[PDB]
Design a protein around this ligand. Structure first.
Ligand SMILES: O=c1[nH]nc([C@@H]2CCCN(c3ncnc4[nH]c5cc(F)ccc5c34)C2)o1
Length: 167
């Protein structure tokens, strides 16, 4: 038993809720919140901008030090940093950004990072401003992640479409 509430169960291990991941993170304090990161960890908008704003820019400060030491992430890759006031840890995962022409097949590699964590609160990778079809992203998530994932979907309309079209 864990503290996630109001989720609809899609599979053995995947759950979905219409929620603001920032507010969901603020109430649950999960062990891991996933950020929809880019390779530079520049948290300017979308989920990343909202998560970073909720940390009062501490996420960005930590991220800039990470990049200065390690260089950029790979598309499909990830790093574990602090969760600040939102979670114990933040798993920054880089899904492909369709608006940059990145290969959508890298979406599976991106979701594989979730398997290193027993339980996660996460957005749909490559959705929103990253330009992928959230229904495809959900399918890849279900077919790739084997650990327990609680998906927060900000937009109520998209949430309803994802549930109603789920196979
Ligand atoms: O048309 C819409 N509406 N919503 C979206 C996307 C869906 C996939 C990723 N993404 C999110 N997913 C889950 N929680 C979120 N909290 C946020 C706060 C913000 F300021 C910006 C984005 C999000 C967000 C928005 O596409």
């Amino acid at each position: 038993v864990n503290s996630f509430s109001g989720y609809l169960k899609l599979t053995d291990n995947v759950y979905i809720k219409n929620a603001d991941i920032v507010e969901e993170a603020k109430k649950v304090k999960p062990t891991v919140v996933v950020n929809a990161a880019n390779v530079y960890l520049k948290h300017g908008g979308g989920v990343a901008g909202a998560l970073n704003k909720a940390t009062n820019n501490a996420m960005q400060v930590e991220s800039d030090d990470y990049i200065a030491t390690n260089g950029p992430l790979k598309v499909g890759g990830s790093c574990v940093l602090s969760g600040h006031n939102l979670a114990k840890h933040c798993l920054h995962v880089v899904g492909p950004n369709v608006n940059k022409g990145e290969d959508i097949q890298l979406l599976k590699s991106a979701y594989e990072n979730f398997n290193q964590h027993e339980v996660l609160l996460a957005p749909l990778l490559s959705a929103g401003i990253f330009g992928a079809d959230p229904i495809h992203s959900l399918r890849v998530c279900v077919d790739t992640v084997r650990t327990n994932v609680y998906l927060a979907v900000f937009d109520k309309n998209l949430y309803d479409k994802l549930v109603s079209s789920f196979l």
